[PDB]
Amino acid sequence: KGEELFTGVVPILVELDGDVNGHKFSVSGEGEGDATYGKLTLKFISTTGKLPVPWPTLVTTLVQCFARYPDHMKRHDFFKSAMPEGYVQERTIFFKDDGNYKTRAEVKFEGDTLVNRIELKGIDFKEDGNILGHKLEYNGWCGDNVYITADKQKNGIKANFKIRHNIEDGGVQLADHYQQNTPIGDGPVLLPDNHYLSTCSKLSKDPNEKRDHMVFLEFVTAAGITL
To answer: Which of 2, 15, 196, 201 gives 145 a disulfide partner, CB atoms 3.0 to 4.6 angstroms apart?
Structure first.
């Protein structure tokens, strides 16, 4: 049972190779996840200089297998059921009146470490916009809930949710997320009934870190199934 792999605290490593408007960047992340509490503590750094995009826009791209599914919902945890072989998480993130991210990630166990290896490609972004212009507040947020649906054709799931990035001088930058997860292995996975993940994140800085970075705390919990 892939859920048995998450009983305690599990170390995490994240790798992101990015390309926004032809400008490349790389982020390395590490930390740990505690699925019993749906808690994630992660630190991310840029290894290629100041990022061309704001950190909050990469939060969702940079491990839903660490969501806490209550006992009455554990039948619907596709993410852990696909472990240790893992799953492929793909997204298209449409930033309103701006460009879009297209991400492909592999979330799997490499030893005793849960690894998230990401390729990201962004196009059609505006220099005088909120993303390339770095006009987004540096702060976490809650929601919108990650609404998950079963995709029996792909033996996986799909998810849809909107992100509302606070704009520094008032306003919000909408980011429409469309998601699809498919297992890497051939083992039987859990296809869930409709439900959602509730997410609240906290972004902060390390006073001793000199590279462009993001200290990240997150709680993710599953809900939406009655009784």
So the answer is: 196
